[PDB]
Design a protein around this motif. Sequence first.
Motif, PDB file in Angstrom:
ATOM      1  N   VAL A   8       8.990  -2.069  -4.434  1.00 38.38           N
ATOM      2  CA  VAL A   8       8.263  -2.911  -3.972  1.00 38.38           C
ATOM      3  C   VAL A   8       8.257  -3.789  -4.296  1.00 38.38           C
ATOM      4  CG1 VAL A   8       5.689  -2.757  -3.111  1.00 38.38           C
ATOM      5  CG2 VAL A   8       6.393  -0.910  -3.019  1.00 38.38           C
ATOM      6  N   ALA A   9       8.916  -4.980  -3.801  1.00 41.55           N
ATOM      7  CA  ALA A   9       8.791  -6.288  -3.753  1.00 41.55           C
ATOM      8  C   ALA A   9       7.821  -6.778  -3.861  1.00 41.55           C
ATOM      9  CB  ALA A   9      10.494  -7.303  -3.197  1.00 41.55           C
ATOM     10  N   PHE A  10       7.693  -8.254  -4.645  1.00 43.68           N
ATOM     11  CA  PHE A  10       6.286  -9.251  -5.271  1.00 43.68           C
ATOM     12  C   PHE A  10       5.247  -8.174  -5.392  1.00 43.68           C
ATOM     13  CE2 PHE A  10       8.840 -10.093  -0.911  1.00 43.68           C
ATOM     14  CZ  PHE A  10       9.512 -11.379  -1.672  1.00 43.68           C
ATOM     15  N   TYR A  38      -7.278  -9.040  -1.989  1.00 46.00           N
ATOM     16  CA  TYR A  38      -8.020  -9.276  -1.151  1.00 46.00           C
ATOM     17  C   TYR A  38      -7.033  -9.214  -0.223  1.00 46.00           C
ATOM     18  CZ  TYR A  38     -10.788 -12.503  -3.384  1.00 46.00           C
ATOM     19  OH  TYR A  38     -12.264 -12.893  -4.102  1.00 46.00           O
ATOM     20  N   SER A  39      -7.683  -9.109   1.842  1.00 45.96           N
ATOM     21  CA  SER A  39      -6.632  -8.761   2.629  1.00 45.96           C
ATOM     22  C   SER A  39      -5.353  -9.328   2.422  1.00 45.96           C
ATOM     23  CB  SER A  39      -8.118  -9.804   3.683  1.00 45.96           C
ATOM     24  OG  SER A  39      -7.939 -10.662   3.928  1.00 45.96           O
ATOM     25  N   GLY A  40      -5.086  -8.410   2.903  1.00 43.35           N
ATOM     26  CA  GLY A  40      -3.275  -9.173   3.410  1.00 43.35           C
ATOM     27  C   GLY A  40      -2.868  -9.117   2.242  1.00 43.35           C
ATOM     28  N   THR A  41      -3.039  -8.559   0.939  1.00 40.87           N
ATOM     29  CA  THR A  41      -2.766  -8.778  -0.606  1.00 40.87           C
ATOM     30  C   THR A  41      -1.541  -7.459  -0.504  1.00 40.87           C
ATOM     31  OG1 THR A  41      -4.702  -6.835  -1.549  1.00 40.87           O
ATOM     32  CG2 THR A  41      -4.425  -9.645  -1.671  1.00 40.87           C
ATOM     33  N   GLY A  42      -1.502  -6.604   0.105  1.00 38.33           N
ATOM     34  CA  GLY A  42      -0.739  -5.108   0.118  1.00 38.33           C
ATOM     35  C   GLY A  42      -1.255  -4.348  -0.511  1.00 38.33           C
ATOM     36  N   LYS A  43      -2.319  -4.072  -0.875  1.00 38.79           N
ATOM     37  CA  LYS A  43      -2.323  -3.186  -1.362  1.00 38.79           C
ATOM     38  C   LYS A  43      -2.725  -1.795  -0.633  1.00 38.79           C
ATOM     39  CE  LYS A  43      -7.683  -3.636  -0.011  1.00 38.79           C
ATOM     40  NZ  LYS A  43      -6.677  -4.981   1.010  1.00 38.79           N
ATOM     41  N   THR A  44      -2.982  -1.326   0.482  1.00 34.32           N
ATOM     42  CA  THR A  44      -2.963  -0.764   0.899  1.00 34.32           C
ATOM     43  C   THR A  44      -1.131   0.440   1.358  1.00 34.32           C
ATOM     44  OG1 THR A  44      -4.956  -0.595   2.724  1.00 34.32           O
ATOM     45  CG2 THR A  44      -3.562   1.015   3.627  1.00 34.32           C
ATOM     46  N   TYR A  45      -0.101  -0.822   1.705  1.00 33.52           N
ATOM     47  CA  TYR A  45       1.326  -0.326   1.933  1.00 33.52           C
ATOM     48  C   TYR A  45       1.666   0.441   0.935  1.00 33.52           C
ATOM     49  CZ  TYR A  45       6.183  -1.238   2.729  1.00 33.52           C
ATOM     50  OH  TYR A  45       7.420  -1.622   2.914  1.00 33.52           O
ATOM     51  N   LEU A 171     -11.504  -5.543  -1.983  1.00 31.00           N
ATOM     52  CA  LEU A 171     -10.660  -5.878  -1.894  1.00 31.00           C
ATOM     53  C   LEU A 171     -11.766  -7.840  -1.680  1.00 31.00           C
ATOM     54  CD1 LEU A 171     -11.551  -5.733   1.859  1.00 31.00           C
ATOM     55  CD2 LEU A 171      -9.683  -6.450   1.338  1.00 31.00           C
ATOM     56  N   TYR A 192      -0.260 -13.339  -2.441  1.00 34.55           N
ATOM     57  CA  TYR A 192       1.162 -13.920  -2.303  1.00 34.55           C
ATOM     58  C   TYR A 192       1.424 -15.477  -1.856  1.00 34.55           C
ATOM     59  CZ  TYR A 192       2.293  -9.194  -0.764  1.00 34.55           C
ATOM     60  OH  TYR A 192       3.294  -7.090  -1.477  1.00 34.55           O
ATOM     61  N   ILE A 200       8.700 -11.638   3.686  1.00 35.65           N
ATOM     62  CA  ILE A 200       7.735 -10.835   3.952  1.00 35.65           C
ATOM     63  C   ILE A 200       8.090 -10.277   5.242  1.00 35.65           C
ATOM     64  CG2 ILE A 200       5.804  -9.629   3.673  1.00 35.65           C
ATOM     65  CD1 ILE A 200       5.788 -10.167   1.240  1.00 35.65           C
ATOM     66  N   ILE A 255      -0.464 -13.022   5.743  1.00 37.59           N
ATOM     67  CA  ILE A 255       0.344 -12.205   6.507  1.00 37.59           C
ATOM     68  C   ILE A 255       0.496 -11.932   8.263  1.00 37.59           C
ATOM     69  CG2 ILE A 255       1.544 -10.180   6.650  1.00 37.59           C
ATOM     70  CD1 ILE A 255       2.249 -10.264   3.970  1.00 37.59           C
ATOM     71  N   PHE A 256      -1.324 -11.925   8.172  1.00 40.25           N
ATOM     72  CA  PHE A 256      -1.608 -11.273   9.597  1.00 40.25           C
ATOM     73  C   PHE A 256      -1.698 -12.402  10.626  1.00 40.25           C
ATOM     74  CE2 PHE A 256      -4.041  -8.001   8.119  1.00 40.25           C
ATOM     75  CZ  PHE A 256      -3.371  -6.817   8.095  1.00 40.25           C
TER      76      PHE A 256
END
Lengths: 420, 106, 149
Positions: A8-10, A38-45, A171, A192, A200, A255-256
């Motif tokens: 996983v990059a970044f 935080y939201s959109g930081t890629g934790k779940t992914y 979060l 990010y 991304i 990102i969102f």
Amino acid sequence: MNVTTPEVAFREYQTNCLASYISADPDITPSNLILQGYSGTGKTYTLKKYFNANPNLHAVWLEPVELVSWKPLLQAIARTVQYKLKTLYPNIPTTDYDPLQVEEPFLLVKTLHNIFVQYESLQEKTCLFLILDGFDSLQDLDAALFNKYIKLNELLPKDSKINIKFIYTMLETSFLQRYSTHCIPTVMFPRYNVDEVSTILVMSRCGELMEDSCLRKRIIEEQITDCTDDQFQNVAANFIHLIVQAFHSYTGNDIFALNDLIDFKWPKYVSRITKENIFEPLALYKSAIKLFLSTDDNLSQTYDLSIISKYLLIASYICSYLEPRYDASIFSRKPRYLQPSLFAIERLLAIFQAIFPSLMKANIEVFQNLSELHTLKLIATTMNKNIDYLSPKVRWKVNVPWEIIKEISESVHFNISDYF
Amino acid sequence: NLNRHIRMNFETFRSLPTLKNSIIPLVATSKNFGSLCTAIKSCSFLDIYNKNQLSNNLTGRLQSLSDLELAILISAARVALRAKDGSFNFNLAYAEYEKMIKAINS
Amino acid sequence: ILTKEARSYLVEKYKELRKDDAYRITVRQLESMIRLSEAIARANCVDEITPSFIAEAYDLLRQSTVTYDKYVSMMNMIVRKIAEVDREGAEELTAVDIVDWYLLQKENDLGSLAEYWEERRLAFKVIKRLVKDRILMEIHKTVYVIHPN
Ligand SMILES: Nc1ncnc2c1ncn2[C@@H]1O[C@H](COP(=O)(O)OP(=O)(O)OP(=O)(O)O)[C@@H](O)[C@H]1O
């Protein structure tokens, strides 16, 4: 067995940190682990990618987003653990306990112990990870709630084969700082960077947009024989870069938000693609200038009102922002940024009569328009339950901003600007 | 170099498990004994761990905002500073944004 | 003596100032603008009050690493140069094209051959600062166009 590291990059520190706390030996992995971002930081992914890179692991996925409160949270844990244990070891003859009988955390501990007793005959100790994504996103949450999940492993029989190794994602940061003294092994996610977001989104949406129906319709219409998927990707990347450079200050490094602008402006941007714009992105940008000059995130004579309604609104705005001191001074022949204040019905009626162009008086139509204003959410009240307008304790206030009342007065030719 | 980290940790906070929580990543991340011999001596990874621990505080969140977001934040802070109660609202922040842009253009 | 187009430029710039007081500017400030343009031309050999002199008088009354003024001076020049090819429809300008043009615009102000490279490097740094401020947009030559802001 040895865990394999994903690419996983970044995030090439946290993917290495996860290999530290997760392993095949249940005597090594800690009883708790929290991932913060935080939201959109890629934790779940990132976490899902890590688990998919090592299928030999065993996990349960739940979302407190779906599980509104803590009772469903426990019930889903029990039910999904039961199902997973049946799936993993069908050969072992086992019985069932009702997952709907869990009313208190002690009952969860009881049910878990009862289930694990059945699997006591297992050859080796088993490491089980329970994954709750967005622990602080729970709709009914309190500080004492999370403590109940930290010190739960040691209430189990420590000689049992099945060991629960909880995993949480958080979060906020005002949440995690309450539990600093517990020294739970924590892995962190920063927001990010702009370059990271740009890379991304290009990596993500390029293949999504290279195959949409609209572009392959427009290519047929424009007879683009030399179009290739490589140039298709380049056009999509130009589109994404243009949106990023035009709207990063508007959306931030999120990102969102950028994804939705990419979706909305994409048809209109496609409509300007012609034979002349295949090789010159500058010309296409010039043709699409009006699309970039406006966010177009807006959902779209702004308020059709009777003259009585317009004058009532004009008077109400004066009431909600002018001191009661000046009423006799201004209207009798004898502030732009603060929140509006309350006013009584008689003050509104008196100012309306004073400003209405011999007396207009108060008929049924006036009060009907006034009630329509309230129904239209142009005037607010001081009550929320059992609405009763005639109760002598209810006051009124204006919900309409300055930018609309300015145009209403312009359409009325009434000079409010000279009253302040 | 390692004793430097140990002394700094001691002088900051004296709970040993907290230091273990940082030592464990260093050991686990180590790939082989040959690389471990080089890694354990200089021990530069604890700095990375410490900065990650601080990456989501006020400074880390402030470092990522864009120019417009930062400007609106500065204007709101200015409004709070001029306020005895230290409070502000969106209208005052946008008015200060307008005034600052007018001044910059002027 | 006031030029004929200077009258239109002056009334436009006076309306611009009067809009901003919605102290407060009165017609005395219009007479003051004429008077300051007269004074600036009075320090020069030409009686023709060009719009540039009125612009200077407007700036002096309205306003009431690299240094601030030297940096801000280049910004107007570069923005106007790009807006020129915007109207003409000619080929867009790269960074080198802007730097060479700007050096040509200030040939008589340079002091020495050594200052040539210094000013070129300062111009590149100013270009980078402007891109960082998103007043110029980079598109792909490395094409610089007026940013949507
Ligand atoms: N390094 C990366 N490479 C590719 N895509 C990424 C990367 N990091 C993040 N993403 C994308 O960003 C998206 C962000 O959504 P994500 O799953 O991280 O939500 P979240 O932050 O956990 O959710 P919530 O804010 O609702 O709690 C991911 O779904 C993924 O597609």
